[PDB]
Symmetry: C3
Subunit: 222 residues, 3 copies
Amino acid sequence: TGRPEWIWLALGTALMGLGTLYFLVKGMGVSDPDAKKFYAITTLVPAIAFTMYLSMLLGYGLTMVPFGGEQNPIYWARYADWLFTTPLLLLDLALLVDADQGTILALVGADGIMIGTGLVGALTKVYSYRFVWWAISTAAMLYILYVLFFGFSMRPEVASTFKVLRNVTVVLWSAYPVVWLIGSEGAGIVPLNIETLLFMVLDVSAKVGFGLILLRSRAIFG
Amino acid sequence: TGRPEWIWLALGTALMGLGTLYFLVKGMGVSDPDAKKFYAITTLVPAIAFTMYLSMLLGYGLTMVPFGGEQNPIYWARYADWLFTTPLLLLDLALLVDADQGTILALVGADGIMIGTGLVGALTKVYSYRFVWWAISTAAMLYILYVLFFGFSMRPEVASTFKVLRNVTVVLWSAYPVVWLIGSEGAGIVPLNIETLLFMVLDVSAKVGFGLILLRSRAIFG
Amino acid sequence: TGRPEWIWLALGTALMGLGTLYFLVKGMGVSDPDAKKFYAITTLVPAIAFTMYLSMLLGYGLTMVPFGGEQNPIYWARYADWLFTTPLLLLDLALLVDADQGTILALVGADGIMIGTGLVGALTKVYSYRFVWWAISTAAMLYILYVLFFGFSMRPEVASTFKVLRNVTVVLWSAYPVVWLIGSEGAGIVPLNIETLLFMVLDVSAKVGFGLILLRSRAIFG
Ligand SMILES: CC(C)CCC[C@@H](C)CCC[C@@H](C)CCC[C@@H](C)CCO[C@H]1OC[C@@H](O)[C@@H](O)[C@H]1O
Ligand SMILES: CC(C)CCC[C@@H](C)CCC[C@@H](C)CCC[C@@H](C)CCO[C@H]1OC[C@@H](O)[C@@H](O)[C@H]1O
Ligand SMILES: CC(C)CCC[C@@H](C)CCC[C@@H](C)CCC[C@@H](C)CCO[C@H]1OC[C@@H](O)[C@@H](O)[C@H]1O
Ligand SMILES: *C/C=C(C)/C=C/C=C(C)/C=C/C1=C(C)CCCC1(C)C
Ligand SMILES: *C/C=C(C)/C=C/C=C(C)/C=C/C1=C(C)CCCC1(C)C
Ligand SMILES: *C/C=C(C)/C=C/C=C(C)/C=C/C1=C(C)CCCC1(C)C
């Protein structure tokens, strides 16, 4: 509790943990191979998130980066979380609409670039350059959003759940580059405790909130 | 030869190397696509292991971690080995029984969490926390063991080889958290040379020993 | 522009960037699922390369390694590029000839070992050992070349484009271990600026040059 942001990291940890356990119990019994796929993907997401929230809470996922003539606290563990979780979440949307492998690779490759360049931006020591990396990560984000709207016989429950989950994704994901820009990785207008609060609300909605909508749907069943 | 554990790292290196070459020569000629799969997976495992044993032997895969008021030698390269090899080994079991993709992802995701949290525990500088990570890695291990027994028309040679390899896995894998807890990553009761000896016997049995049983079986052929 | 090699890193960055945009525009409209696969793979390659060239140009992808009694500049970001791009390129060849999954895994696993051991060699602080890692990476390279010639009903356009792209691969890839050995990672005969020039010509040919030949071919269409 030395750092003011501990509370939001604690709550993130708890909520990802409880979400994972909920999904895990909910997907017991599931015999449908397609349903198993969606549960496996959607439960793994908050499982990984739990581990990386814990790491930040305990101090392990935090590093100091010198820039602006300061030693800046950067939580590097978010990118380790997002490196795996954001593609799994895109895979959830991809499988729902029976995407072509070529489209799956494009989403996943663009997403790896999004998070990888975002990470490089987070750890870059020349201040002006950090925003060069932010711009590149955002171009990759915009690509991903474009494919979700314009890149994809489909059952009506699948169509309907996809349109909901796609709208949840556009709104929530588009917010991340904004928090990063105004927070302590970027311009440093909003302090880290508030930034951490913003990412915890964003992540819990994008993982547990997303997963509740998906796993309650008939779309996950063949 | 400055460090007493060099011998076991040398022998591990030799034995993984010779195993890889044996499997490589054994899988020449193989035309059956299913058989190719099992050889590719089972030969890659000791190939990666060879590289990471060499790295520890040469000094590259070793790092000092400060905890307990000591500078502790931690061989970080084991987790780089296991990050890739333990899933490949689970993939061997998964393909043998024609597992659903949802089950394959669950095993592989749980295994990534097992090794990733194990790594974080290995490098953590607050002593009490290291065992928080050990506990979490063990929960993920227990999950994996559960799926192998309760998560899975099957040919009798496949059934029979699976039950052998599953029993080899349960016995050998369950030993790793024990060695780690009592060794120099954990409570520091057993010294590092003996710990290194325990992991070399464990790894060689779990990779080369496992691979001998699998690759001698008729189960690998469609 | 403090370091003489900046020019080649700038030009590499520009050329990978323009290549990516060219491929991206060229693969708009593509409805054929097989064609989408090849574009997704072949566009992702210079996309990742662009990011890692930029990182070297900006200073981020550079590190000092002490060996020979010097502080040696090693561009570590090449291996982060190649870790993902060389397998994707092998996947391009693999899918062209309808390779068995067992062969795909062997190529990809051998390639991961090639680049991983190459990375360990690049960062190793005992000079003589660096070349132990170089030897091991080269054995893995030779394995890969062997499979491409001896490891693989096939349409004649596919046969023909494969033989072209395979010859482009053998010639270009075999050059990398040579540049590394005589450059600043190895014996230090050729200085870093010239070495950087050699890798930029090699990478642009192997990614954009390769991709031009592949994406202009009828082989990519089912
Ligand atoms: C010991 C304490 C510190 C408690 C913390 C442990 C917990 C919060 C985090 C551990 C998560 C991880 C080890 C378990 C997640 C397993 C996922 C791979 C579950 C995927 O499950 C689906 O895939 C199989 C499908 O058939 C479907 O039924 C799902 O259950
Ligand atoms: C130069 C010395 C230092 C000797 C050390 C080299 C050696 C011990 C380690 C190198 C291992 C690696 C480069 C070769 C392993 C290749 C695997 C991918 C083999 C997979 O093989 C199967 O997959 C193809 C299948 O069709 C089946 O036939 C198998 O052979
Ligand atoms: C803002 C500036 C700094 C400009 C730099 C951005 C640019 C050079 C690098 C960004 C690359 C990345 C974000 C976009 C690459 C997307 C690939 C995944 C494209 C794969 O495209 C294929 O896959 C889908 C298929 O259907 C086929 O049509 C292809 O288009
Ligand atoms: C569960 C976590 C999720 C869904 C995280 C999503 C994160 C992003 C869409 C982040 C995007 C960013 C950019 C577009 C610019 C650079 C900074 C990032 C990584 C925050
Ligand atoms: C070839 C290597 C194998 C089969 C290694 C298996 C390793 C494990 C099952 C390790 C498990 C661990 C825990 C359950 C707790 C934390 C420490 C570990 C990683 C040793
Ligand atoms: C786009 C980049 C490509 C096609 C890079 C290919 C790189 C190699 C084939 C590198 C091979 C090396 C060895 C065989 C020995 C050790 C050093 C390396 C990694 C340069």
